[PDB]
Amino acid sequence: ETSVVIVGKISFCPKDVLGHGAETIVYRGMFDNRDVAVKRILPECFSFADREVQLLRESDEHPNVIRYFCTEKDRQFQYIAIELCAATLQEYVEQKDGLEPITLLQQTTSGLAHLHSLNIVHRDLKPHNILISMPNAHGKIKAMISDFGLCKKLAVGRHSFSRRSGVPGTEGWIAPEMLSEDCKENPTYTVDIFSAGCVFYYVISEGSHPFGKSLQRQANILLGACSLDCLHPEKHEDVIARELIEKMIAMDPQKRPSAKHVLKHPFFWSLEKQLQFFQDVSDRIEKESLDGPIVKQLERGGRAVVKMDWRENITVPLQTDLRKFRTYKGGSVRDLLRAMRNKKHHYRELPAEVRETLGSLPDDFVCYFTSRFPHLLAHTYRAMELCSHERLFQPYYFHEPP
Amino acid sequence: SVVIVGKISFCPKDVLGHGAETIVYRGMFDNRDVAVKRILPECFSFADREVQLLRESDEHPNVIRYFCTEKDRQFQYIAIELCAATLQEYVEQKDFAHLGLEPITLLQQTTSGLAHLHSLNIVHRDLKPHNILISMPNAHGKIKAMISDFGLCKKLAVGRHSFSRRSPGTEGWIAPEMLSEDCKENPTYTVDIFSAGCVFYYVISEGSHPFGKSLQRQANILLGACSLDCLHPEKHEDVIARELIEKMIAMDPQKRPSAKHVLKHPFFWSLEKQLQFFQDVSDRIEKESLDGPIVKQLERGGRAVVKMDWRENITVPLQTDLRKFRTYKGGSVRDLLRAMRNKKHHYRELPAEVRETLGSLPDDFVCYFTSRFPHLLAHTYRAMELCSHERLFQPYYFHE
Ligand SMILES: Nc1ncnc2c(C(=O)Nc3c(Cl)ccc(NS(=O)(=O)N4CCCC4)c3F)cccc12
Ligand code: NA
Numbered sequence: 053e054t055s056v057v058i059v060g061k062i063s064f065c066p067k068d069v070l071g072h073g074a075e076t077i078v079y080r081g082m083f084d085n086r087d088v089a090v091k092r093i094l095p096e097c098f099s100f101a102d103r104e105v106q107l108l109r110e111s112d113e114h115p116n117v118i119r120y121f122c123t124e125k126d127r128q129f130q131y132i133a134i135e136l137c138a139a140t141l142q143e144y145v146e147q148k149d150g151l152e153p154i155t156l157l158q159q160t161t162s163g164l165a166h167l168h169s170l171n172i173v174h175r176d177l178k179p180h181n182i183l184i185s186m187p188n189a190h191g192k193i194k195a196m197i198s199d200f201g202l203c204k205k206l207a208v209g210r211h212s213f214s215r216r217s218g219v220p221g222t223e224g225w226i227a228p229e230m231l232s233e234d235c236k237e238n239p240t241y242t243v244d245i246f247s248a249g250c251v252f253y254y255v256i257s258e259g260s261h262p263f264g265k266s267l268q269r270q271a272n273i274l275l276g277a278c279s280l281d282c283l284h285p286e287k288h289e290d291v292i293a294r295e296l297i298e299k300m301i302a303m304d305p306q307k308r309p310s311a312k313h314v315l316k317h318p319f320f321w322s323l324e325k326q327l328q329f330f331q332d333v334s335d336r337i338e339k340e341s342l343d344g345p346i347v348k349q350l351e352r353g354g355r356a357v358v359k360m361d362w363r364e365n366i367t368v369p370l371q372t373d374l375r376k377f378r379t380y381k382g383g384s385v386r387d388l389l390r391a392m393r394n395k396k397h398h399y400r401e402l403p404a405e406v407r408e409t410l411g412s413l414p415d416d417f418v419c420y421f422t423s424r425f426p427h428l429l430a431h432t433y434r435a436m437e438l439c440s441h442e443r444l445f446q447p448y449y450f451h452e453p454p
Numbered sequence: 455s456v457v458i459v460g461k462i463s464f465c466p467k468d469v470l471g472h473g474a475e476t477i478v479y480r481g482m483f484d485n486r487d488v489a490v491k492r493i494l495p496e497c498f499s500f501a502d503r504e505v506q507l508l509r510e511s512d513e514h515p516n517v518i519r520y521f522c523t524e525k526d527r528q529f530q531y532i533a534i535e536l537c538a539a540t541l542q543e544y545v546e547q548k549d550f551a552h553l554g555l556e557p558i559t560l561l562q563q564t565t566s567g568l569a570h571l572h573s574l575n576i577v578h579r580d581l582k583p584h585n586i587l588i589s590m591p592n593a594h595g596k597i598k599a600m601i602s603d604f605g606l607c608k609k610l611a612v613g614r615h616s617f618s619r620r621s622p623g624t625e626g627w628i629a630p631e632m633l634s635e636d637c638k639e640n641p642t643y644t645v646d647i648f649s650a651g652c653v654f655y656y657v658i659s660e661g662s663h664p665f666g667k668s669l670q671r672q673a674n675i676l677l678g679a680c681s682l683d684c685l686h687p688e689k690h691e692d693v694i695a696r697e698l699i700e701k702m703i704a705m706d707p708q709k710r711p712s713a714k715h716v717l718k719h720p721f722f723w724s725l726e727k728q729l730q731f732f733q734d735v736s737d738r739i740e741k742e743s744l745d746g747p748i749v750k751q752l753e754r755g756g757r758a759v760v761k762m763d764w765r766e767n768i769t770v771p772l773q774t775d776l777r778k779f780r781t782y783k784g785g786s787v788r789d790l791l792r793a794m795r796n797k798k799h800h801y802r803e804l805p806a807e808v809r810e811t812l813g814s815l816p817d818d819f820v821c822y823f824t825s826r827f828p829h830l831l832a833h834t835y836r837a838m839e840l841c842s843h844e845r846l847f848q849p850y851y852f853h854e
């Protein structure tokens with residue numbers, strides 16, 4: 053048989069190497085009949101390891117933060133046992149190897165939101181540090197934040213920390229305020245949002261980084277020289293994702309959304325929720341004045357969203373079906389929405405050929421319109437910040453708690 | 455003193471409770487505060503069961519967390535998460551610190567833990583208030599409910615739905631089919647639903663049990679002699695809860711709903727979602743014929759639900775604002791719903807005193823109608839089972 057090391061409850065074969073984690077090798081192993089990854093730590097890092105561990109313990113469990121099982125000390129080494137995972141997000145993306153990209157980012161973000169709410173800033177969020185679970189008994193996989201080596205629990209009352217309190221991060225993923233010549237403001241929770249923002253693009257672009265190839269990454273970060281050109285400019289899903297990512301990687305940290313703010317963004321909406329947003333908007337503006345601020349804002353830049361005449365950009369059965377009220381102005385955002393609402397509401401009553409083009413409510417119906425009008429949701433989400441304070445629109449927008 | 459085994463440590467003075475005639479100490483594991491369960495050689499087979507099954511199912515937030523087992527010369531030790539109290543203390547201890555955990559949410563969490571166990575083919579067999587634990591507060595002062603005590607659990611093999619009634623534990627909360635050899639059907643997952651059903655009634659009645667006081671409980675369960683008399687039959691919230699609980703404690707196991715089905719019941723709906731259900735229903739049936747099977751089902755026994763004429767049982771300002779629509783029939787369930795749909799939609803346009811009588815959307819608005827018409831939801835839910843398969847009605851009903 054091959055070699056096996058046993059240190060109390062922890063056991064592993066040194067041939068079964070899984071990778072590394074900053075610096076210390078990581079082996080596949082066993083603990084309490086659970087499959088676990090096992091990290092061996094040298095004497096010089098004992099002090100650091102214990103501070104990572106305590107922080108992991110003294111911080112509530114969350115499904116998207118990595119489960120810590122046990123540590124066993126030894127005359128030569130220290131041993132940290134955690135959840136065995138299938139891969140890093142890096143390996144997932146690099147190797148192109150069921151699991152939805154958006155759901156992965158959502159789970160990563162919830163893990164981040166959870167840490168921030170415990171006044172923990174991660175400081176080293178990157179594809180290597182986000183682990184992807186083994187499938188559970190029902191086949192389901194999830195993303196999980198790991199590697200708490202640069203973490204900082206900020207004291208109660210503090211909302212920031214010093215740039216120079218440790219290592220700044222991993223070159224390529226470090227927010228500009230950590231390394232810029234002038235420290236105009238101390239870093240806060242928004243360092244992780246910048247990193248997260250870069251991670252998002254990495255996943256969506258299937259391997260690219262907003263600030264370019266590895267060699268010049270950090271220098272471009274300081275210059276603000278990003279390019280999000282893996283995102284199609286006339287594609288709904290990419291338009292939406294560009295809108296979010298741009299804010300997440302903004303040079304001014306105060307302009308970056310909080311982790312909870314990011315989770316409210318249309319990027320993460322189901323198709324049903326998108327359709328429901330369009331309905332609520334339509335209903336809300338049904339008896340609104342064409343010269344009042346809401347419709348002015350909704351029609352500002354509207355010709356481009358509509359593509360001049362929206363009745364020319366739909367399938368023929370719908371063109372035919374929309375010859376009933378000629379009050380639907382083909383160059384109106386309002387009326388386009390108004391028409392969507394009408395054909396969602398009266399869907400059951402519509403001709404069989406018309407229902408065939410649109411597709412079934414809610415998924416295929418909404419995609420019919422978002423596929424054909426790629427700026428419609430992004431434009432409508434922005435304009436209708438005017439009504440964000442209203443009860444109806446509170447699920448779609450983010451507000452700091454009372 | 456202080457005892458130490460391997461990684462487990464505890465002071466034997468700090469006793470939290472007792473068990474299989476087993477002791478539970480407050481203690482320590484891997485620098486965590488934990489509960490330490492000490493078990494005798496007699497109950498090692500059932501210590502191995504708990505441990506194995508907690509390792510399979512403790513990822514769920516409402517299942518108790520399992521940390522470590524240490525075997526000894528005389529004893530065995532299981533370290534699990536330390537909890538504040540049991541459900542029994544939460545219900546019966548006077549002026550208990552609820553700490554934001556509402557009854558309905560407690561039961562939703564309990565049931566969600568149960569649905570998790572069932573999806574792993576694990577049947578609990580001993581669910582009762584003593585082993586539904588209330589957590590320690592988290593960093594934001596939130597507490598939660600958790601399932602525990604997995605000694606009597608059972609893992610069924612794949613495509614085994616049923617298990618043999620073995621000779622359990624303590625009486626009071628056990629389904630009839632698990633005790634009486636008189637029953638034709640061997641027990642299944644629905645034994646836990648029965649127990650859950652008694653637990654529901656216990657929580658919302660604030661101490662009472664559908665089959666009576668301790669002495670007569672298990673005898674009443676065999677006889678099928680329940681009483682749900684703490685649920686008032688003309689209060690909305692109690693009519694909804696009664697419909698659910700009657701099904702959960704049914705004498706025929708097959709009639710009891712599964713845990714996922716329970717979680718879909720109106721009992722657990724927000725005020726917003728109840729309103730949304732009324733809106734969807736009204737929209738669904740707007741252009742249905744009055745002689746069709748859906749409206750026929752909706753109007754079957756409708757005069758009682760509407761209190762003969764719903765116009766005579768609403769506030770005066772709403773009466774006036776509805777006189778506009780001449781076609782609304784006072785004896786019609788459909789038109790009551792169409793009236794609710796209409797005024798939700800046109801709410802912001804409505805007159806000041808009509809808005810003021812209805813109350814704000816969605817919560818006060820929906821309660822206006824449910825308070826005055828306590829069978830409306832329960833009736834409409836039952837009736838619109840006809841459209842349960844349709845996509846629109848996916849959030850409201852359960853599809854296997
Ligand atoms: N396929 C993989 N599965 C699991 N792990 C992997 C790793 C890894 O690095 N694992 C790992 C381990 Cl074994 C132990 C500690 C930490 N550090 S920690 O900060 O999470 N931490 C210390 C306080 C308690 C938690 C760690 F990140 C790297 C590559 C692949 C995998
Ligand atoms: Na976890």
Ligand code: NA
Pocket residue numbers: 512513514515516517518519
């Ligand atoms: Na748990």
